Amino acid sequence: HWGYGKHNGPEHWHKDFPIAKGERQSPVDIDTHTAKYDPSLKPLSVSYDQATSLRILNNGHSFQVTFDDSQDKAVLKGGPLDGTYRLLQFHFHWGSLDGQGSEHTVDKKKYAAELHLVHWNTKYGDVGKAVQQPDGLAVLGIFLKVGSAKPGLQKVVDVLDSIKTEGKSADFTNFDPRGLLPESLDYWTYPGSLTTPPLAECVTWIVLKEPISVSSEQVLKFRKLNFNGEGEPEELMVDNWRPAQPLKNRQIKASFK
Numbered sequence: 379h380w381g382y383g384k385h386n387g388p389e390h391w392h393k394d395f396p397i398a399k400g401e402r403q404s405p406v407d408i409d410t411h412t413a414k415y416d417p418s419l420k421p422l423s424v425s426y427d428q429a430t431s432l433r434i435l436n437n438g439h440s441f442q443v444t445f446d447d448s449q450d451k452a453v454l455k456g457g458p459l460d461g462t463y464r465l466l467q468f469h470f471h472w473g474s475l476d477g478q479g480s481e482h483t484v485d486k487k488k489y490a491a492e493l494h495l496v497h498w499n500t501k502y503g504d505v506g507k508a509v510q511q512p513d514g515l516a517v518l519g520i521f522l523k524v525g526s527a528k529p530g531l532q533k534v535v536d537v538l539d540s541i542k543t544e545g546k547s548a549d550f551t552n553f554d555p556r557g558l559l560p561e562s563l564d565y566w567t568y569p570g571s572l573t574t575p576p577l578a579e580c581v582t583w584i585v586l587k588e589p590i591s592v593s594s595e596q597v598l599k600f601r602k603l604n605f606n607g608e609g610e611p612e613e614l615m616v617d618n619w620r621p622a623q624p625l626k627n628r629q630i631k632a633s634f635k
């Protein structure tokens with residue numbers, strides 16, 4: 379089964395998921411000088427006030443916080459998007475050290491981690507149908523750098539002890555994802571894919587220019603999670619990032635000058 383190790387990592391994924399070598403794979407390097415300001419791009423609309431978080435889960439890849447997506451509660455609109463995209467889950471990718479961990483890069487710079495808020499287009503009715511569409515998902519990507527703590531992340535960090543190994547989950551209600559957002563909603567956008575199998579080419583990527591800062595203690599708690607299930611040889615869940623993929627016939631657009 380796929381993972382991030384030497385024998386099952388990103389360089390192997392194409393064997394089970396041939397779209398890994400596709401025309402719109404993610405992540406990519408964002409070359410800030412080549413991204414073109416698009417004045418026709420709207421401001422992003424992030425409407426998270428009514429978000430209902432449900433559970434936090436170690437899925438063997440990452441940890442994720444899942445939301446109730448059975449109603450338009452926490453939605454992403456505007457920007458490059460047509461229609462309404464419901465927040466389903468967020469998760470992170472991170473490194474073994476602070477100089478790596480992000481999936482997208484900015485002028486080849488890697489951040490310590492990257493937060494993905496995954497939303498699906500309500501015109502397709504459910505996320506499984508949305509994954510089969512070129513505009514089915516919108517993932518809001520936010521870079522994490524190490525410095526000051528992000529207070530809004532601490533509730534997440536403090537429960538990771540209870541989901542150390544693959545398969546473990548916990549109640550995680552009343553979590554407000556607005557506490558994870560940076561000040562600016564300036565973004566880059568391009569058409570891409572899921573960055574984990576099945577690597578489906580269904581994502582409008584919206585990557586915020588402004589990172590959030592998290593503390594060393596916060597990211598260290600990410601690095602104590604395990605890829606393995608309980609009772610299996612302990613393999614720290616670190617470096618769960620796919621590297622940048624070829625941009626191919628794509629333009630990255632910027633919402634800002």
Ligand SMILES: CC(C)(C)C(=O)Nc1nnc(S(N)(=O)=O)s1
Nearest residue numbers: 494496505509517571572573574
């Ligand atoms: C809900 C569902 C389809 C299982 C999902 O979200 N899958 C993702 N696979 N890769 C993602 S990423 N790292 O691009 O945000 S999300």
Ligand SMILES: [Zn+2]
Nearest residue numbers: 470471494573
């Ligand atoms: Zn992700």
